[PDB]
Design a protein around this ligand. Structure first.
Ligand SMILES: [Zn+2]
Ligand SMILES: [Zn+2]
Lengths: 221, 221
């Protein structure tokens, strides 16, 4: 049994300040095209000189040093859900943003036309809702896909709100073409930190956009 | 206190990451009308349960323990220049904003007609620039007027930019009706932090909007 069970899943009704998870998926994601790491804090992270409405430096934390050097100084694209609480490169990183993973090679990884993907959503067992998600990458991180999914469901199904969720449990499952499938829980532990919760993107898991499937499971009450 | 000394003024040409001062005065200030503090980290601060983009909890550092309990149970108005780096580090509040002072009692501090105040500006000794500023508060913090003067000079005379300033030095001089006058240096020391610099507002100095005057002195590179 690789897939979770009722008891394994976190209940949104026990979470304090679940609005923090809400603000992460409701707001825009950090996206950048064809950039190169300019610095490094620890051996398993990389820093980029890119900018967004609230930052001019972005620090991504990857699986380990091997993955960091694998992408260091190499031309890559960034797609990630960022946080600010407890993020900085010292008392000399006034406007930094942090994320985990969300890194993909830029060269030869784009599609002419976006590749739409169906997201099968089940609620209390009943698979009663399906929608489309799209990407421009041949190899897209699970994080990019995940965000687009939770963003859509946050706007259209109140998966998240500045407060409670109308759902009790929920989780996203990715089914790779031949590799093993994996999942992420939509809700954190009762007392959590944005930084700890986002570690789920730390492994930088990437997928083949043309052959991967996505499944969401929600429970109400 | 006594007017600044030519050699006592910080030079923007020496500042590292001056764009950090830019973002402070370019973006919107934090303002709230009828609110009572809700919590308190240290005895000299007050936490408010108000929000804006990026934050839903605001912490203001006042002069001392005495000033905080003075407003603790009061409905007040807020007007401050907020920062986030090294703001509220307690993994139980991940969306806090921080300002210094900027507090005034709400009750009976409102004018039916806004008070215009003439800000006179000198550039290299020549007083060649005048422009109005306004407030609704009978008693207004120096911080509010200071922010309005910089935002205006930032968007109209290039006081700050996402890079260097066209001015090497510059200070704002407040001249209360009877009390001693005082000033604030528009620029920080070479290496600094938004948190440190903003301490110029920690005393929460408030002026009479009807009898106070403002003077600005800048020099070109
Ligand atoms: Zn690209
Ligand atoms: Zn008021």
């Amino acid at each position: 049994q690789q897939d979770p069970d009722p008891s394994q899943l976190h209940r949104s009704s026990l979470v304090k300040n679940l609005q923090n998870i809400y603000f992460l998926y409701e707001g825009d994601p950090v996206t950048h095209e064809n950039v190169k790491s300019v610095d490094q804090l620890l051996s398993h992270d990389l820093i980029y000189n890119v900018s967004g409405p609230n930052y001019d430096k972005l620090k991504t934390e990857l699986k380990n040093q091997e993955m960091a050097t694998l992408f260091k100084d190499k031309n890559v694209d960034i797609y990630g859900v960022e946080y600010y609480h407890l993020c900085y490169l010292c008392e000399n990183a006034e406007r930094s943003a942090c994320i985990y993973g969300g890194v993909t090679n830029h060269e030869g990884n784009h599609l002419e036309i976006p590749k739409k993907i169906v997201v099968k959503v089940s609620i209390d067992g009943i698979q009663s809702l399906s929608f489309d998600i799209e990407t421009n990458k041949k190899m897209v991180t699970a994080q990019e896909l995940d965000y687009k999914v939770r963003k859509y469901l946050t706007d259209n199904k109140q998966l998240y709100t500045n407060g409670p969720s109308k759902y009790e449990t929920g989780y996203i499952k990715f089914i790779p073409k031949n590799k093993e499938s994996f999942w992420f829980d939509f809700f954190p532990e009762p007392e959590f930190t944005q930084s700890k919760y986002l570690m789920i993107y730390k492994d930088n898991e990437t997928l083949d956009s043309n052959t991967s499937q996505i499944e969401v499971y929600l429970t109400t009450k």
